[PDB]
Amino acid sequence: PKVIVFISGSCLFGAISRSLFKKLPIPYTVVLLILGAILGVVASNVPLVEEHTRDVAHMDPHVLLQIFLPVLIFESAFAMDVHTFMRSFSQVCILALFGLVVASVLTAVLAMNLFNYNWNFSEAMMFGAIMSATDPVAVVALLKDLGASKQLGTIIEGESLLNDGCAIVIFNVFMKMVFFPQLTSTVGQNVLYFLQVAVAGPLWGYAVAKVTVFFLSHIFNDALVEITITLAATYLTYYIGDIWLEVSGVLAVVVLGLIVNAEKTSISPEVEVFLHRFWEMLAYLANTLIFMMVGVVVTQKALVAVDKMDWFYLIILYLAITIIRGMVISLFSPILSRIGYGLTWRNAVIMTWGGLRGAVGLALALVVENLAGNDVIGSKFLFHTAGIVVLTLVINATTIQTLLRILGMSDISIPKRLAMAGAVRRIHEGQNRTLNMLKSDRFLADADWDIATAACEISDPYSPSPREFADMMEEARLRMLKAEKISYWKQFEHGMLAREALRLLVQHAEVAADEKDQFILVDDLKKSWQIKGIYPWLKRKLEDLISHHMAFEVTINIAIVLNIVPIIMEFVKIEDALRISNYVFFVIYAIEAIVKILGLGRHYIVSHWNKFDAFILVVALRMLRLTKALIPKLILVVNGKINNQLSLGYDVGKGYIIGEEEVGKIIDRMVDNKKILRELKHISETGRLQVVKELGLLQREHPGIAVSVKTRQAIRTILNHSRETIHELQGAGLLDEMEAHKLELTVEIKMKRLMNAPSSIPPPPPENLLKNVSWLAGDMKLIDFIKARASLLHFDYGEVIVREGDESDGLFLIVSGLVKLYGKVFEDYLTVGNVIGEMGVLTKKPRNATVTCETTVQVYFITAEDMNIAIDTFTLYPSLEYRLWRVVAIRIATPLIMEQMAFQGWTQEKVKLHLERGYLVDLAESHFQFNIDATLEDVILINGTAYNAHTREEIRSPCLISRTVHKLTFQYTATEEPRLFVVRNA
Amino acid sequence: PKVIVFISGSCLFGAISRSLFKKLPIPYTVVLLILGAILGVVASNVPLVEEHTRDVAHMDPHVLLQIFLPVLIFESAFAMDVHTFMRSFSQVCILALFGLVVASVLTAVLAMNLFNYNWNFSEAMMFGAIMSATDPVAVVALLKDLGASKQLGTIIEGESLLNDGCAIVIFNVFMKMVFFPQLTSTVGQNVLYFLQVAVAGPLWGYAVAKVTVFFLSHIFNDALVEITITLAATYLTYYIGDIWLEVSGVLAVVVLGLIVNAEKTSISPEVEVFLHRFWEMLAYLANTLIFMMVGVVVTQKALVAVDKMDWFYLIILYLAITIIRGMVISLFSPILSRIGYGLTWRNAVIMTWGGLRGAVGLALALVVENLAGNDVIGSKFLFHTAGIVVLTLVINATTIQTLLRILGMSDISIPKRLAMAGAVRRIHEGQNRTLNMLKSDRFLADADWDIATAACEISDPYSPSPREFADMMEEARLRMLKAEKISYWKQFEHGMLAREALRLLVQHAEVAADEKDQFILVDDLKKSWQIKGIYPWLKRKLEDLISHMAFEVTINIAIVLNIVPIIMEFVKIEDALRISNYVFFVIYAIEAIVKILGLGRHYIVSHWNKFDAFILVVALRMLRLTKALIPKLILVVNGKINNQLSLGYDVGKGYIIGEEEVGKIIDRMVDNKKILRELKHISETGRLQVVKELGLLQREHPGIAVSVKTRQAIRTILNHSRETIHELQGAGLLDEMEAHKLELTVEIKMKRLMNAPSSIPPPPPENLLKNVSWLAGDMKLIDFIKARASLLHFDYGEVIVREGDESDGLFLIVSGLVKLYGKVFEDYLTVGNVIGEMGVLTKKPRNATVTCETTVQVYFITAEDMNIAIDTFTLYPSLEYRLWRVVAIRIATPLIMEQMAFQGWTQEKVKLHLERGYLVDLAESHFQFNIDATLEDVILINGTAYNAHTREEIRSPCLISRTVHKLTFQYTATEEPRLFVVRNA
User: Fold this and answer.
1) Smallest Cβ distance to A447: which of B447, B450, B710?
2) Alpha-carbon dihedral sign for residues B514, B519, B523, B528
3) Helices B626-665 + B879-899 axis angle, to 10
4) How many CB atoms lie within 10 A of CB B690?
5) Domains of chain B in sequence order
6) Of B274, B427, B714, the CB nearest to A455
């Protein structure tokens, strides 16, 4: 058998038709089919080409059924976006299953009473099933090429996959019924077989996928072991499926592919991209081979047994299948709308014409033709399937192209056009200035400028009247929504916000912008983060109440595993085996009894588990012993299952509140209408307060998960900033490349190890919180002195702690609860770990706020006189006074520098770093004389009065002072010591 | 046959031993071997495991010889650094070949007269050949694990590859001689076979590699076609080599692997990394399988036919092979030193112990054991080879680790330690300030700070007296060299300098720093860029003098058609012959008609047509194809010279810019006059010599230089556009996928540029006059200047203009090289460099002298015409503003550079910084300027400044600091003051 030339020519023709058929809208598979037809007619004429093509044109059905199908289905599974697929699992699954069933039955009942073949009922079901299969890849490809709607692509791909799997299953059972009639089909074993293929396959695939993921989670700095392990696991599942029920192996591999593709943490990205490329290449090879094979086979023998009526019938069949495909979706759209997963007019219209028949139908046609022998049914099946495929693959493509061009999907929004125009203009200006600069140097003044300026051009690829006040409302709304949307992207760019939270926030913003006079709401986000109130909490609640050395328990657990072997023996030369078994059982009994004795020795009390162990010993059922180890793993999986959702909710809330703060700061210099400004500020502040209260309560309800999430966020931010500093240091040429590479490798290893951190860290004790105050930066004498006299207080809900119009009794520290701060317009909520009244004790001013308790609160109280003696006792350079005033100054100075220079490109994190780099300066060594230089950028006066010499102008406080002034002097005031905050350059 | 469980268990054991045997120095293959031994003894005891392992333990020699070897050799070829390998081709090739030959012969003559087997000569030759193999991946692995040197790793890898490639051939021929004695070995056909396996194989591999590369160079935006094409090409070459010579196939695939790995432009990086990973995985699978197989086989049957003396002999054999391996290098080191490719003491010592036997010897032992049948030679061969491998794989590893620890290779230089300490300190400070900032916000005040601060720590992984004049001298020298290297790294980081040029420059800097009191020289760089003077220039010189159009295309096609009858000539037989005759006749007529047509086109017979008429009269179509053969030879010579010229130009430009920066920075480092004078003298002498040499090199042949300059300009513009796109994407102004498609367009443009034509013809002088910086496409200005622009020609050795004279007018060098000398001030100007802009702008007498170093063509414009053209035009983008802006930035770049030459400011950054701003006039400001905070730097070009609250005179040209805030100017008839201010974004 000679086969090499056929495969090499197939690869060559596939590459040629991929390269030279790209601008055309129709796919290259039609060219492949006609090339196969030419090869078939040539081989029918010339005998040598017939000898060279017979070895592959007519090959066994078993190799086709066992290699060409599972690879295609597994690639279709691997090319999925799993999350958007599971977002609409129920809708797509019910639609695919019911539509497949009704389409197959209708096509079978059409083929039975139409035509003149006098076909039976099983042949009708086989014919109906082999053309209900659709193609996932092509539809998603040309939907992504024009229209840009990911929901439609994901639902159509999921429908195609769920159609292909069920079509394969039903075709297989009906072929087994029709071609090998020796089998028996009693109801009991048949329903057992259906239950087996329904439930047993996917469970096995899921189990092996979980085991493989768990094994891969422990591999560090090894990109070659995991690839081999993954391939071996995939083949092992396929082999178990093959030796098992054949119709279930495809289900097992698609389940494993979905599970493996869903997981993205324990697998490094390089392994993922390599696996994607590998399976894509294998599927491409299979597709090319099957198309050429079916072209040759349909041309050689299928087209010499047809008539005029056989050409007449396929048009009717195509019309019928299109009509039923449209009718199913038309009938099922209202139910989907009523339940809450409805579609629209345009999506239904495009999904009616989005059904392309792929290569799986060709494979099943080849199988039925090869099994049919030298009969006519194989020729009819192959001819009809090839005709339907070659019709739809061009007709539906052209129709869907025209439909997209004639509807609103192939349209570009005006803001997108404006953004593209601005980007193109900026690129053109940058290129022009770069060229103008580069024309001036004396080393590159000879190059041909026409070629250089013509071979690098960038072109755009896209080409009191109520009405007045309402128009102001509309433009204000649209501009505010634009600002929020750009802020949520700036947050993601620095790596602070998660991808899913960003997607949800931008989707909500777009939904709010689309609807007229509709602001962004908080109830939808409340639903987004309220998912914790779900039955998993009830599993946790029941499971926690369900509930000498430690090595004894581990050894006993192991002992139980040993007992499993005798069990198997019981389940079961023979004499010797039996004898061994009795001895083994006796030994196990002895061990158990000894274990019980040891337990009694360690403890004489009797418990429920002790009573159960005594009953077990009295019996001499080892499965009842493993629950002791089963329970903690169930706890550990429920912990992560709730931790993921809590993390997502916290990220969404924090992103929304920070973006809203920035947007509220940016509106102040846009429009100058008092009423609209008042309304916008009112809405923003109401949303902010409600969101912060809800997040505070959510954190308070269960603290361990919140503590774990906060720790993970802090660690991630610190590591990201360290990586950025390493990259900046490498870019300046201070160190060699490979040292930076190994440092980045260490950082990446740290991040990967963090990704598998334990969840639900227990909350710290109050002393740990008191040891982590910002100004109490590990000063042993200060820590000891403050811990010596720190009083602890407890207040019930509904009481008032302190009130304004009173002297500063002392600073407070919230160590448990949620406190409402209300005063003079000024409303906010403070939580655990937030000091109260620093400026009250520093400036010796009366209180300017009122404190109320919204839950049971525990606070830390320190007297002000003790603080005063501790601060006038210590006079070191890093004194507590400097730390306190620096913290208060940066806290009071961030909003001022933000609102003064809120130009396009300044965020919260950047301003915080900018103010963090600088440091406070005193007037003792400057003799009350300051001169503003160019090294320092911004200078802000916190409190006091300023003066000059050549202008002599009073300066109110707190105020940032611009660069107009030059010399600053200060008088001697007993009631106030003036302070300044200056920030210098690098 | 059941084979699944064995392969699955092999994969599992390979993964387990890779994971759990990483900190240990010895490789995991010893664990694999002992696991195979345990499996063998278990299968010898239990019958079921014997049934499950017999199907794979004893497999055919043909599948082993035809799959397991070529994959290993091709992976070894693919895992090479080709450029550093070809840097020392001759040394490693002669060393590997001669050492292989002498070691094999000595081992054969040892095995013949030692032992007691009474072996023949063929068996001794095979025995010597099967243990001369070497493991490439292990040596490079343990070398790169420590410091080592790229040179040592590359030479040892090349030697290992060549050793395996020749050992396979010699083993193949001797096995064919010894096991199938029916073959005939007459001298003629034997030497024909040797010539075939020497020359015909690599030529075929090279031809297919070139064809595949040419086909892949035309594929754009398709990452799946090229992978399949590459795999199909590799298999096709393997198949042709396998059916052809069954030994030379390994030579064909190693040549193809080297050629494909060398090429890196027509193949996208994703395809390259995918191919690397694929072949690495296949080789890993093969290695694991062969080690487990040989463990099982050696344990089951090889160890039951040995005695005390059979345990005694292998130690002697190991000592002998180590001794001869050392002796070969010891003898051949002086010759290598004499020719110019010598090694050192430490490299020879480490390369003596760097010979690790790999899996290839195991495969050949399995082949000879399986072919030997139920005899004793197979058992002896397998036992000896397994013993040698299991000895060396631990003994040489431990010995080389101890040797590296006991010599200077495993040492870290003091500057490296200082740099690591500084980087760790900076990282620690950054982490501390980030943590201090993050402890303050009110949304993250609850996280456990101990865990956060303990789970992110970064730790360092490394743990008149001439004496005083001498120590300051050396400290200045190392400071210069450090500045030079960091300047080169800064140049490379922006993407301006090539990788090879950067490597060469840093290597030269390190070499100069290692030698005492040795500055960086220019003669070595002169040798680096003088490679253009080589015999390829002579091929070009002879080839150029050798030297509707659709007719010629048709003529070539006709020649191909004529080839068909020729084939038959070499060859229903009657029918075939008749058809052939008919075709021949027909051909003889189309060619005659084409010749008649040519005659009707050109009456006189052409020089080629003179012999074409004889060709027609004969009725030998190979002589016709030279017409199309010649231009492709011209193109390939053009490319081969273009690469070298580009490398030389890059090296020169990088060195001169780095030297300028290094000369600028040192001015505020040390305060001794004599050393400053000497240092500046050396720097300026080197700069002038390099610039003169580069000018002459550009002048000698202009087309290649023009092409190189155009490529550089296009690359820089595209890189800056990509940077702007990335910055725009980072600010959230546009969505991600639009930026992705723009970057895809930019990448497509870069890839299309990479295949640009070479040797662009030089532009005409009018094109150069149309591309002056201030003549930015102003139609009236261009027409007026082209109306009166005089053109002059001056011979070598004359003086164009001299100082102490009125400004006659600005000049423009359109051809030649001109020396500008005057008042200390010496430089060289080339084509496209305007002369005397400040002379005509400020109406000042000349301050320079011009001499001609070659024949020069210049453009002369009278100053009166410039004056009337400049007082006629008064638009906002006037020529006066452009001229003064260009002169001001040119005169202001060095001042702002030298004033603020802090660590982190380069030429390109300062040029962009000064380019962003623009000049301001005093007409609308009423001679009043007040400095705001938006603008950064302000420089007074010419004139005198005045104040109000200080009233201080300011000399020119001078950048004015942040001391006075109000500037006023008087009305001066002899001078109009100007300022250059640069503002913020």
Assistant:
1) B710
2) positive
3) 60
4) 20
5) 63-410 (1.20.1530.20), 546-630 (no CATH), 765-873 (2.60.120.10), 882-983 (2.60.120)
6) B714
Report the C-alpha gap between A598 and A593 in whole angstroms. Answer: 9
A527's CB contacts (< 8 A; 6+ apart) are none
Sole residue written with tokens 């495991």: B49
Mutating which of B48, B424, B434, B885 best tests the A interface, going by the most A Cβ atoms within 10 A? B434
- Nearest-CA distance B709 → chain A (Å): 5
Chain A residues close to B413, C-beta within 8 Å:
none
Contacts of B284 in chain A (CB under 8 A): 224, 228
DSSP assignment string, A164-177: HHHHHHHHHHHHHH
Q: How far is it, in rounded angstroms, from Cα A426 to Cα B967?
A: 35
Q: Are A163 and A328 in contact (CB under 8 A)?
A: no
Comparing CA positions, the residue from B360, B350, B344, B359 lying closest to residue B325 is: B350
Q: Are A209 and A255 in contact (CB under 8 A)?
A: yes
How close A262 comes to chain B (CA, Å)? 23
SS3 A936: strand
User: Is the Cβ–Cβ distance between B133 and B167 less than 8 Å?
Assistant: yes
Residue A295, Cβ density class (10 Å: 0-12 exposed, 13-18 middle, ≥19 buried): buried
From chain A, the residues in CB contact with B434 under 8 A are 717-718, 721-722
Q: For residues A807 and A845, give the distance between their C-alpha atoms in angstroms, rounded to a whole number.
A: 7
Alpha helices in B245-307 (DSSP H): 249-262, 269-300
Residues of B whose CB is below 8 A from A718: 431, 434-435, 438, 452, 456
Q: Which residue of A has its CA nearest to B963?
A: A933
Check whether B846 is labelled as a binding-site residue: yes
**Number of neighbouring beta carbons within 10 Å of residue B458:** 18
For residue A857, list its beta bridge partners: A795
For B187-215, give one letter per residue: b (16+ CB within 10 A) or e: eeeeeeeeeebeeebbebbeebbeebbee
Residue in A48, A277, A723, A728 to test binding to B, most B beta-carbons within 10 Å:
A277
CA distance A635 to chain B (A): 22
Give the closest of B436, B461, B933 to A963, CB-based: B933
CB-based contact A746 B829, cutoff 8 Å: no
Q: How many CB atoms lie within 10 A of CB A572?
A: 9
Collapsed DSSP state (helix, strand, coil) of residue A814: strand
Question: CB A651: neighbour CB atoms within 10 A?
Answer: 22
Contact B844, B838 (CB under 8 A): yes
Contact B443 A654 (CB under 8 A): yes
Contacts of A479 (CB under 8 A, 6+ apart): A667, A670
Q: Which of B437, B653, B690 to mutate to test the interface with A (most CBs of A within 10 A)?
A: B437
Single-letter residue type at B500:
E
Q: In this structure, which amino acid lies at residue A135?
A: D
Q: Which residues of B touch A818 (CB under 8 A)?
A: none
Question: What is the spatial distance between Cα A761 and Cα A703, in angstroms, rounded to a whole number?
Answer: 9
Distance from CA of B745 to the nearest CA of A (A): 8
**A287 vs B493: CA distance, rounded Å:** 45
Q: Which residues contact A330 (CB under 8 A, 6 or more apart)?
A: A348
B837 assigned binding-site residue:
yes
Residue B130 in contact with residue B360, Cβ under 8 Å? no
Is residue B298 classed exposed, middle or buried when 0-12, 13-18 and 19+ CB atoms within 10 A define those classes?
buried
Residue of B nearest to A14 (CA): B225
B666: which residues sit within 8 A by CB, 6+ positions away?
B479, B480, B483, B679
Strand order in the sheet with B825-829: B825-829, B818-822, B849-852
- What count of other Cβ atoms lies within 10 Å of the Cβ of residue B257? 25
- Provide the 10 A C-beta neighbour count for residue A163: 23
